[PDB]
Structure of Epidermal growth factor receptor:
Amino acid sequence: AMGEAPNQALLRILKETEFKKIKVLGTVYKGLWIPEGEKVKIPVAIKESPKNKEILDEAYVMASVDNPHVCRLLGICLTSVQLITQLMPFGCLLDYVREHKDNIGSQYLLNWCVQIAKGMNYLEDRRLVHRDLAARNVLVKTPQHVKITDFGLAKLLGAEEKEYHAEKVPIKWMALESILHRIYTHQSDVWSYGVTVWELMTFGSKPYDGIPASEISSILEKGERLPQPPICTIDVYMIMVKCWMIDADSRPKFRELIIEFSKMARDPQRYLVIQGDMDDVVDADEYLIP
Ligand code: NA
């Protein structure tokens, strides 16, 4: 019998003249946003067919979330459409672990696990199922601060609604119930979290490398899972494995994963065994909008 409360988030519409594109990043540009008369320059990423409707669905979700471990939308620009978000200078975490694989220690790894779980727990409190959690969809602000991104598949659940039933989706990150029945829940995001942790702990290897996506569900039905990464103690691997239980309500909760990884991060070498272990510039996190 729980009802729904209003979503009073504010969608900010930016003027094209207020931002300057500097260089291409991927099209996504790195640039500066300079709102008129405010004496600030904010580093931004500027991401530039009627299916426009997907970028607006994405804008709607990003305007509705506010957490230090979820990506920050500054606004949209309605030219012939641009989505303006906080610049995350070190890019996506998958590429970051692959490129710095010889300089990544146990403290960094465990702290990233904590932060992603905090962001995901926040999304669960907002009743949002992300549906595309992966290392590619975590962005790096600094080595010590990461945030979840890419809300293009995300869905808001009603207050009395446990499942989203879908009508292209990344098979190797998906829970088995999502592959077989198009059912998505916060517990299916937990399966994807487990896969995401596996990508980090292997320094960015591809899951189920060389196995085609059509084979994956039958592999999982037979009881097989991703293998224990060389650096992982049984304590860390057991958490991943629990994320990949068939029974979705047997999987850990994001709030539990925060607790378990924060304990490990207090004694990181017990849990991972690793070889060799401008004046007016304001970051978006210090530019608060009513
Ligand atoms: Na060690």
Summary: Residues 132 and 153 are 6 Å apart (CA to CA). The pocket of sodium ion is lined by residues 269, 273-274, 277 (CB under 6 Å). The chain has two domains: 1-87, 88-277. The domain at 88-277 is CATH 1.10.510.10 (Transferase(Phosphotransferase); domain 1).
